Design a protein around this ligand. Structure first.
Ligand SMILES: *[C@@H]1O[C@H](CO)[C@@H](O[C@@H]2O[C@H](CO)[C@@H](O[C@@H]3O[C@H](CO)[C@@H](O)[C@H](O[C@H]4O[C@H](CO)[C@@H](O)[C@H](O)[C@@H]4O[C@H]4O[C@H](CO)[C@@H](O)[C@H](O)[C@@H]4O)[C@@H]3O)[C@H](O)[C@H]2NC(C)=O)[C@H](O)[C@H]1NC(C)=O
Ligand SMILES: *[C@@H]1O[C@H](CO)[C@@H](O[C@@H]2O[C@H](CO)[C@@H](O[C@@H]3O[C@H](CO)[C@@H](O)[C@H](O)[C@@H]3O)[C@H](O)[C@H]2NC(C)=O)[C@H](O)[C@H]1NC(C)=O
Lengths: 461, 122, 122, 122, 51
């Protein structure tokens, strides 16, 4: 059959391929000022239209871990923040010897903040005057081996210099939509019982991703999205115990924090035409920062995780164990709330041992029961080798942080004496793993409109 | 029909209404240098594909009838089976070897055939 | 005739010598990134317009006779007076409602008509 | 045949296989803002050249037959001599004067010639 | 008088101030029109216009 080959334009064929994506944010942010919030400045106004559409007969493979779209997210957001800390004051005169009081409180039932003083460059560069400021303890270190106990150092000048964050920018995460150029398309996986790899038996073309909240975290996944029907647990390979297992949660668990201290801001003029802000006297009494969770709901949620970790290691029972320890930045749950940065020692949430059976919440002994302590830092080395410093200025008043837990980051721990109660831990990790928990549904493809098939036309000269 | 209302669909359905997948090469707006890098868009993709599609004599973003002969050594699945049953999204994966030969055959035949226009009106 | 030597002129004068207004889509020189965004210029506008004009079967930057039936419910001013008396800069403002329907009618007619071509030499 | 496999060659050889020289308007990748200016590429050159080539009725990147009369006062070297012996790289140097007049003649003839189709179809 | 509100920068001597004319000018696809009626009250129709 002497058929003549033809060519078609507009063919539906996919090729998984790499590309950049546009960061886009909701409309209401764009009447505001520059960098307020940052999503109004470096990201485009968005549009939910058109509606996501199902591809009726398809079968497409997804690989959550091998995806690199999250890496484009990571690089873009870091470059975004780096540009945000150019137009602010680079501190500098405050890396001096700080004379600090040494009275001590010594009586317990209290944990306090240290009072310090320093000499400053006013509107005359050939004059210095006296100032004082309250500094949270981690930000200040002893000065020298020469044991003058009153002479203390700001933690900088050992590794880097620092920049104050301008008050005109705030940290509340505006939602972002990582969005495709024309000629590319975003495909969304619609299987809820999805193990993270293999074929998604239901797939849809989507204009671009639903709102991502880039909420900073290190030990737990705050405000976000929850599972359709139950807990789903994901990891690349349980053979290597060193990899980070991600657990999603179906029902939310609620967390609320508070800084009951009433800090007051003190304005200091540091160099020509630029100001530094510190903490003045604390109004009222001194109290401890804390976060609360309801313990029957936490226990139930943890047991529901337990019946999903037992699935892969049936002969071995479950034990949740305290964090790794060592560095504070690893062995603590840290996050951002109200512009301040909390650092929680969280051994209290993750002590127990689960045994497959269901130890129930009912009957409730006390419905008002809860499980409840965190430190605060201003000098933040927020990513390694990024221009690490950010000096978070104090905020006035007090704050609360009512929020939802939607997943855990864990370490599966190696064996010991072949014990039936082989254990699990909370696990700090990269911020890429934080955002990999929320873009699993998506992949990127490149459309190929030109293809060839046999028609039955003949041709004319 | 949407941007991909025929992915995994049959030849008959997917070859009618080709336009819906051809129009959407128009988007993009400002975000720094990398965006304007990211605007290859139609600006390169469409120009490339249209240059190929015109060099072969098919100046049209739709079905076009070329003349190069389909061959025994490239097909090997029954002719009548393909146009009723299969999808593009499994046909391109079976034909993917012989793209480069066809992409030269289609243009050398065009140069061969437009030459006879010079004689047939001289 | 200049860049706009027919604005407010009658149909006959403005429909002949359309080229003078079609060619002025080439310009631009460096004033940084904000200017280089300004080079969407012809690079996007001309390609959008030509994509539309080719999807309707009219691969030509001039008068092209499509077949879609003009209707009683879109015209309502007498036929003969339009082509002698009136200018584009008021015709567009009479007709501006029904652009989108027409823009789909012309392409579905093309997809219809090239299909019969596919059979008429098969 | 390579990017310039006919430079200084006879007209017959250089007028066949024009495609090899037409296709090589696709390259270029990132080096800063100056490179992003440097990629005018097809994106301006090809759009310009194809706009001229289509405004003259020749929507094809190959030999096209226009109608404008070659003249005694532009040629002055024997007709049979040129096509067999000479090369483009010395023909353009003799015809370089009358480009601008031909570039308007070719388009006004095209506008003149599409009109007779418009009214005949009417 | 500085240092009460901001810092300051000396103007380089290699740049001088006297205003050179500028022609704010259109891209292709856009066009600039000019209103040729001198008795024009800032609004309303320009009954003579030029491209
Ligand atoms: C962190 O440490 C810094 C120091 O390093 C603390 O800052 C010091 O705070 C004190 C208290 O405010 C301040 O001393 C007062 O300054 C006032 C300025 O107006 C003075 O008027 C006042 O004088 C009275 O108190 C003295 C005792 O402190 C008396 O000896 C003196 O005679 C005055 O008393 C007479 O006048 C009052 C007027 O109200 C009258 O009622 C009395 O009857 C009497 O007739 C104080 O000297 C220091 O100046 C501050 N130091 C600096 C460097 O600024 C800071 O408070 C610490 N932070 C915290 C949270 O505690
Ligand atoms: C800063 O701290 C103060 C005091 O610690 C907070 O004020 C208190 O806020 C709570 C709400 O969070 C108020 O509770 C109210 O209780 C009544 C009880 O009948 C109830 O009807 C309301 O629904 C509400 O829950 C409380 O009245 C209020 N004041 C005190 C003295 O407790 C303040 O909210 C904190 N601000 C921030 C930004 O953290």
């Amino acid at each position: 059959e002497n058929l003549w080959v033809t060519v078609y334009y507009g063919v539906p064929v996919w090729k998984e391929a790499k590309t950049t994506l546009f960061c886009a944010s909701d409309a209401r942010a764009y009447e505001k000022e520059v960098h307020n919030v940052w999503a109004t400045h470096a990201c485009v106004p968005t549009d939910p239209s058109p509606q996501e559409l199902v591809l009726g007969n398809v079968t497409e493979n997804f690989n959550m871990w091998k995806n690199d779209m999250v890496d484009q997210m990571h690089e873009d957001i870091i470059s975004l923040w780096d540009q945000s800390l150019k137009p602010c004051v680079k501190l500098t005169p405050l890396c001096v010897t700080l004379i600090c009081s040494n009275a001590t409180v010594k009586n317990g039932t209290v944990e306090e903040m240290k009072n310090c003083s320093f000499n400053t460059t006013t509107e005359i560069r050939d004059k210095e005057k006296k100032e004082y400021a309250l500094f949270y303890k981690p930000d200040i270190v002893p000065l020298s081996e020469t044991n003058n106990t009153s002479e203390y150092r700001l933690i900088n000048c050992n590794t880097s210099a620092c920049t104050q964050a301008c008050p005109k920018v705030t940290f509340e995460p505006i939602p972002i939509h990582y969005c495709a150029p024309a000629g590319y398309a975003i495909l969304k996986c619609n299987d809820e019982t999805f193990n993270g790899t293999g074929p998604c038996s239901n797939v849809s073309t989507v204009q671009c991703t639903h709102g991502i909240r880039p909420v900073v975290s290190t030990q737990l996944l705050l405000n976000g999205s929850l599972a359709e029907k139950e807990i789903v647990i994901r990891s690349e390979n349980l053979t290597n115990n060193a990899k980070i297992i991600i657990v999603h949660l179906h029902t939310p668990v609620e967390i609320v924090c508070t800084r009951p201290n009433n800090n007051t801001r003190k304005s200091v003029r540091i160099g020509p035409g630029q100001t530094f802000y510190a903490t003045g006297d604390i109004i009222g009494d001194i109290k401890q920062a804390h976060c609360n969770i309801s313990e029957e709901k936490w226990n139930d949620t943890l047991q529901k995780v337990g019946i999903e970790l037992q699935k892969h290691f049936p002969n071995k029972t479950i034990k949740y164990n305290q964090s790794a320890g060592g560095d504070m930045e690893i062995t603590t749950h840290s996050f951002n709330c109200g512009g301040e940065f909390f650092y929680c020692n969280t051994s209290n949430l993750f002590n127990g041992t689960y045994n497959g059976t269901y130890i129930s919440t009912n009957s409730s002994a006390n419905s008002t029961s809860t499980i409840t302590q965190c430190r605060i830092k201003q000098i933040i080395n927020m990513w390694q080798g990024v221009g690490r410093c950010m000096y978070a200025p104090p905020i006035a008043g007090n704050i609360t942080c009512r929020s939802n837990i939607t997943g855990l980051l864990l370490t599966r721990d190696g064996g010991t004496n072949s014990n039936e109660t082989e254990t699990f831990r909370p696990a700090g990790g990269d911020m890429r793993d934080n955002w990999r928990s929320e873009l699993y549904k998506y992949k990127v493809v490149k459309i190929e409109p030109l293809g060839v098939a046999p028609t039955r036309c003949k041709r004319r000269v | 029909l949407g941007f991909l209302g025929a992915a995994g669909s049959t030849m008959g359905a997917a070859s009618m209404t080709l336009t819906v997948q051809a129009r959407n090469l128009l988007s993009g707006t400002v975000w720094g240098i990398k965006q304007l890098q990211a605007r290859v868009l139609a600006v390169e993709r469409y120009l490339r594909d249209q240059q190929l599609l015109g060099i072969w004599g098919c100046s049209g973003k739709l079905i076009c009838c070329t003349n190069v002969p389909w061959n025994s050594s490239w097909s090997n699945r029954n002719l009548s089976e393909i146009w009723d049953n299969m999808t593009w999204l499994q046909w391109d994966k079976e034909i993917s070897n012989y793209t480069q030969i066809i992409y030269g055959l289609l243009e050398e035949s065009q140069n061969q055939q437009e030459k006879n226009e010079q004689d047939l009106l001289a």
